[PDB]
Design an enzyme around this catalytic site. Structure first.
Site, PDB file in Angstrom:
ATOM      1  N   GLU A  45       0.831  -1.222   0.000  1.00  0.00           N
ATOM      2  CA  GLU A  45       0.000   0.000   0.000  1.00  0.00           C
ATOM      3  C   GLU A  45       0.886   1.304   0.000  1.00  0.00           C
ATOM      4  OE1 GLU A  45      -1.877  -1.384   3.504  1.00  0.00           O
ATOM      5  OE2 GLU A  45      -3.723  -2.020   2.551  1.00  0.00           O
TER       6      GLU A  45
ATOM      7  N   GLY B 145     -12.211  -4.348   2.409  1.00  0.00           N
ATOM      8  CA  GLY B 145     -13.230  -5.337   1.939  1.00  0.00           C
ATOM      9  C   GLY B 145     -14.525  -4.605   1.591  1.00  0.00           C
TER      10      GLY B 145
ATOM     11  N   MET C 231      -9.017  -2.193   8.900  1.00  0.00           N
ATOM     12  CA  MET C 231      -8.454  -2.383  10.256  1.00  0.00           C
ATOM     13  C   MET C 231      -7.715  -1.174  10.802  1.00  0.00           C
ATOM     14  SD  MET C 231      -7.426  -6.400   9.798  1.00  0.00           S
ATOM     15  CE  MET C 231      -6.861  -6.620  11.454  1.00  0.00           C
ATOM     16  N   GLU C 232      -7.708  -0.090  10.050  1.00  0.00           N
ATOM     17  CA  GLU C 232      -6.973   1.122  10.539  1.00  0.00           C
ATOM     18  C   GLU C 232      -7.762   2.446  10.420  1.00  0.00           C
ATOM     19  OE1 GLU C 232      -5.461  -0.709   7.850  1.00  0.00           O
ATOM     20  OE2 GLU C 232      -4.525  -2.114   9.281  1.00  0.00           O
TER      21      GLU C 232
ATOM     22  N   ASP D  95     -11.243  -7.214  -1.884  1.00  0.00           N
ATOM     23  CA  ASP D  95     -12.075  -8.444  -1.713  1.00  0.00           C
ATOM     24  C   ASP D  95     -13.480  -7.977  -1.362  1.00  0.00           C
ATOM     25  OD1 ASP D  95     -12.259  -8.588   1.417  1.00  0.00           O
ATOM     26  OD2 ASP D  95     -10.114  -8.299   0.865  1.00  0.00           O
TER      27      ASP D  95
HETATM   28  C1  MTA Z   1      -3.661  -8.502   6.683  1.00  0.00           C
HETATM   29  S1  MTA Z   1      -5.034  -7.908   7.695  1.00  0.00           S
HETATM   30  C2  MTA Z   1      -5.983  -6.967   6.509  1.00  0.00           C
HETATM   31  C3  MTA Z   1      -5.253  -5.634   6.095  1.00  0.00           C
HETATM   32  O1  MTA Z   1      -5.870  -5.156   4.864  1.00  0.00           O
HETATM   33  C4  MTA Z   1      -6.999  -4.245   5.108  1.00  0.00           C
HETATM   34  N1  MTA Z   1      -8.187  -5.027   4.703  1.00  0.00           N
HETATM   35  C5  MTA Z   1      -8.305  -5.382   3.363  1.00  0.00           C
HETATM   36  N2  MTA Z   1      -9.442  -6.188   3.170  1.00  0.00           N
HETATM   37  C6  MTA Z   1     -10.002  -6.324   4.471  1.00  0.00           C
HETATM   38  C7  MTA Z   1     -11.136  -7.026   5.029  1.00  0.00           C
HETATM   39  N3  MTA Z   1     -11.965  -7.832   4.302  1.00  0.00           N
HETATM   40  N4  MTA Z   1     -11.375  -6.903   6.333  1.00  0.00           N
HETATM   41  C8  MTA Z   1     -10.616  -6.170   7.164  1.00  0.00           C
HETATM   42  N5  MTA Z   1      -9.555  -5.469   6.737  1.00  0.00           N
HETATM   43  C9  MTA Z   1      -9.230  -5.555   5.431  1.00  0.00           C
HETATM   44  C10 MTA Z   1      -6.878  -4.022   6.607  1.00  0.00           C
HETATM   45  O2  MTA Z   1      -7.085  -2.615   6.939  1.00  0.00           O
HETATM   46  C11 MTA Z   1      -5.515  -4.548   7.092  1.00  0.00           C
HETATM   47  O3  MTA Z   1      -4.474  -3.544   7.028  1.00  0.00           O
END
Ligand code: MTA
Lengths: 236, 236
Positions: free
Chosen positions: A17, A83, A178-179, A202
């Site tokens: 990223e 996601g 997640m951030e 995804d």
């Molecule tokens: C490896 S953990 C997922 C990482 O990608 C991002 N991310 C991408 N797709 C998802 C998803 N389905 N759920 C949660 N975080 C996601 C998050 O912010 C974290 O940095």
């Protein structure tokens, strides 16, 4: 800097990223602070400080504190993958958040709203200046980029059950990650404007890890490209 | 003699512990950083930085980042109170954590264990010397306490069914609260030794007839006294 040039801190959780932004940084210099590498340099008319924070709420929030305290950042931007959970949102589409919320915070026993951390607002509002500029970038691209709500938690969302829990809690959520709300909470407490931009890796399905592994390089790349167009359009 | 005077950051959640510690600081000075108040000064052989704990993962991670970058803390101590979840603990017993874990983190689709943050160990390790020294203070002062696991999440978990789920997942958990593992994850990322300690505000069966906010008045004082003994016994 000259005129309204800003020092902008930019946080990506993972290497995929941040790589393209690093390839664009002029007059770059590495700095080690609390065991993470920060890269200072120029882009367009502004000064950036780039960092790969690591995944999740704690790692990202540490980098906001150091970006503001140590690097004197005047604004904070998160970029990366997410996601897709809304209808009409596909892998590769961009969401620019106008607000962030946590989907995994429950302090309702102390009379807070579901999602609201104690001592904080439920929704963190992205800077309206930055939202308007990014809204115009997406418009000019003439595809399916959207502005709206991104929800954050310390989990990788992979399964219809956790999508349904999140959309029940927040029916207008577009994407999950997640951030973003962690960086928003930290920058809000520091008093600095922020925004989050994501590209979908995804659709948070039960096997979303397989899809994320396929598309993380592209999702990092796409979010970074939109962010750079925003930086070209942020005046001084 | 060895490392000499250690600059130690103390994140105290109980306001009567923080006021008692501040009352004991030599050359006490107040500082504002990112809108939060820190106190610096000396106690016994060490320099301290005292700060009231925030709530949750993000405010914990900012506090450790600021203690280490801005104030040059070389160690992090976090104290507070929390209800017991293991059956055998009594009101007022002190849990000295030797390990912290998250109860609310799910990146299992990628193959991590439940509770394990991406890019992190599942359990974080409090400094073994700090754990031994604190256990010895408790023994010397004839204060009841136990060393073991504390589990953290960004929720206040009030329902007993959810507590039982966390105990099923982490069999030896002694107590559950909202900052310890974030303190641990941040201090470990920074490379600094740390420890998390909690007085038990209630038993696992909820035998207490005093509220948490009443418990922490006298418990905050007890915890300040134990901490100051620990700092007297921390070598230079
Ligand atoms: C490896 S953990 C997922 C990482 O990608 C991002 N991310 C991408 N797709 C998802 C998803 N389905 N759920 C949660 N975080 C996601 C998050 O912010 C974290 O940095």
């Amino acid at each position: 800097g000259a005129m309204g040039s800003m020092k902008i801190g930019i946080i990506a959780a993972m290497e995929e990223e941040l790589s393209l932004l690093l390839a664009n940084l002029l007059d770059a210099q590495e700095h080690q602070v609390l065991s993470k590498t920060y890269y200072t340099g120029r882009f367009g008319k502004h000064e950036l400080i780039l960092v790969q924070s690591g995944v999740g709420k704690v790692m990202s929030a540490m980098t906001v504190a150091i970006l503001v305290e140590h690097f004197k950042a005047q604004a904070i931007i998160n970029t990366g993958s997410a996601g897709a959970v809304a209808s009409h949102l596909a892998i590769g589409d961009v969401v620019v958040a106008d607000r962030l919320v946590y989907h995994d915070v429950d302090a309702t026993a102390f009379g807070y709203a579901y999602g609201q951390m104690a001592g904080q607002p439920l929704y963190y509002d992205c800077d309206p200046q930055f939202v308007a500029i990014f809204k115009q970038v997406l418009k000019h691209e003439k595809t399916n980029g959207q502005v709206g709500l991104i929800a954050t938690g310390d989990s990788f969302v992979a399964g219809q059950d956790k999508i349904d829990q999140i959309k029940t809690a927040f029916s207008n959520v577009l994407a999950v990650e997640m951030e973003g709300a962690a960086i928003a909470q930290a920058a809000h407490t520091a008093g600095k404007p922020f925004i989050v931009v994501r590209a979908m890796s995804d659709t948070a399905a039960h096997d979303a890890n397989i899809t994320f592994d396929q598309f993380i390089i592209e999702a990092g790349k796409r979010s970074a490209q939109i962010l750079m167009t925003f930086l070209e359009n942020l005046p001084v």
